[PDB]
Design a protein around this ligand. Structure first.
Ligand SMILES: O=c1ccn([C@@H]2O[C@H](COP(=O)(O)OP(=O)(O)O[C@H]3O[C@H](COCc4ccccc4[N+](=O)O)[C@H](O)[C@H](O)[C@H]3O)[C@@H](O)[C@H]2O)c(=O)[nH]1
Ligand SMILES: O=c1ccn([C@@H]2O[C@H](COP(=O)(O)OP(=O)(O)O[C@H]3O[C@H](COCc4ccccc4[N+](=O)O)[C@H](O)[C@H](O)[C@H]3O)[C@@H](O)[C@H]2O)c(=O)[nH]1
Ligand SMILES: [Mn+2]
Ligand SMILES: [Mn+2]
Lengths: 274, 274
């Protein structure tokens, strides 16, 4: 049950002015595509705060990738869900290498001691979080937050547009193209190319996704085949067949070194590390 | 639990081409605004059929308004949720005046025997439908369907843009403006002016809405005040404080006699009767 929003003063939406004229802001299945200029964060923050929302964020730092944690967490503190409850889950083989990072109020971190990229689906599935968070966000650790990433992303199931393919034809998408693999997508199918480095949703939907992809990967293994982009290939197959309820623009998954800063991106929020 | 969609071939969404350049297609709280060109109905039909969705439609035909039923139902048969399960609920004081209209398969009608406009909230609330339908759609009877109205509208809570105000400033919206009324909205607040003639959602959310508006109306009555546009005024207050998850364009609530057929409307779906 959701109580009423309080009185707020903000600009009137303009029905006869599109919010963006340069990009698609809704999918053909009526899921919002989240770009700067599509949302009023004061309204969303109200809505999610009134539900006392807690966001879990999963990150794997195995072997040498522990060196990415300090910047990742420090920048998360600055830009990820600020003002809401957050629970970081750091999956690692070196609990002692986890850096000591100061957290804001309402924010906590748990260290969970544990090919590597692929096995994430399995591990996320097993830890499905049900009692502790409302949403789960699953990301790569070799990244930093450079701008706002907040409750605008939250929804039962979301994927993110891979920054190498948001302008590409589906023929050019690097989907798994061998029929022998459970991740197989034909050249005449596909909505988008979603990035393996940033997906999420409610705990229930994320558990479902990660279970499905793990099961698919096991079948492929039993069949002596490995998907061309591993977890990302299976993620893409899952999201083709189970459409996400929100799609994040490449603002939320970017590499400025390789791609610069095009006019279509008003903000670069979550980026590869230089 | 939602099973996988089957393989389908349809045009690729174009991330760098907006679907509409003349209208706002998403609210600032990231609810889709449903216009022609925003949705692929084959994808939505798949999604809703896989859930065996049943849609209830409520309509009140009290006193002389029984004469509107024949056209209303005949045109609903042609254009409303065709291919899905539908349950019409006709609220009337003259069960014998309900015309005999031939229904397609999967479609049924119930006659429920019962100021008039206002009391709808109360009656809808009491009949909340929970065992028989997944969604409820609540409309005026003095209307006809002239084009597709389908599962693209379905969501936990929706309102429809009143056709007299979709281009107007919020100052010009005919909200209740007296602080004494529970429907009061100040001149600096308001997103949209929603029509009383077409709203809906899941049963739970509709029961909540109709209960809230009924309660508000009773308080106003006890206080010796009646909202300027009655149920519609209270609907608008409720939807200001509880944002809808989808907003229907005026394609879904139109009067061609009074407003013609502007270029911004590609389809006129649900219209006033000439
Ligand atoms: O020793 C590890 C390893 C991973 N992780 C964890 O796994 C995440 C993903 O790994 P990456 O970030 O490395 O992957 P991305 O390329 O960003 O990611 C891409 O390429 C991958 C294959 O490797 C392809 C690949 C491997 C090495 C070098 C270049 C590569 N390449 O691209 O051609 C997969 O196909 C991914 O799905 C895809 O998105 C890290 O952020 C850590 O959290 C650890 O903790 N510890
Ligand atoms: O004897 C009835 C009555 C209603 N209903 C049922 O109630 C519905 C709404 O009534 P209407 O469709 O009449 O209302 P709308 O104007 O479309 O509707 C507007 O004006 C209304 C006030 O009346 C204002 C009003 C009343 C009379 C004439 C002109 C009016 N006017 O606009 O200035 C309310 O303010 C509405 O919320 C508003 O949308 C009908 O479709 C029937 O289902 C019956 O079954 N049997
Ligand atoms: Mn990476
Ligand atoms: Mn009417």
């Amino acid at each position: 049950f959701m109580v009423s929003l309080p009185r707020m003063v903000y600009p009137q939406p303009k029905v006869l002015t599109p919010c963006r004229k340069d990009v698609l802001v809704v999918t053909p299945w009526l899921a919002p595509i989240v770009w700067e200029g599509t949302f009023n964060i004061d309204i969303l923050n109200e809505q999610f705060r009134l539900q006392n929302t807690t966001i879990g964020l999963t990150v794997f730092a195995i072997k040498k990738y522990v060196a990415f944690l300090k910047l990742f967490l420090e920048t998360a503190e600055k830009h990820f869900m600020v003002g809401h409850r957050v629970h970081y889950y750091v999956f690692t083989d070196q609990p002692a290498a986890v850096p000591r990072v100061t957290l804001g109020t309402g924010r906590q971190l748990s260290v969970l001691e544990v090919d590597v990229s692929m096995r994430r689906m399995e591990m996320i599935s097993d830890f499905c979080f049900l009692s502790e968070v409302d949403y789960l966000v699953c990301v790569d650790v070799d990244m930093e937050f450079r701008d706002h990433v907040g409750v605008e992303i939250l929804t039962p199931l979301f994927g993110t547009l891979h920054p190498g393919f948001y302008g590409s034809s589906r023929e050019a998408f690097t989907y798994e193209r061998r029929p022998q693999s459970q991740a197989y997508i034909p050249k005449d199918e596909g909505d988008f190319y979603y990035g393996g480095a940033f997906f999420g949703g409610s705990v229930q939907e994320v558990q479902r996704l990660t279970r499905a992809c793990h099961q698919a990967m096991m079948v492929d293994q039993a069949n002596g085949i490995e998907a061309v982009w591993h977890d990302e290939s299976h993620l893409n197959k899952y999201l083709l067949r189970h459409k996400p309820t929100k799609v994040l623009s490449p603002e939320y998954l970017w590499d400025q070194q390789l791609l610069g800063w095009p006019a279509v991106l008003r903000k670069l929020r979550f980026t590869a590390v230089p």
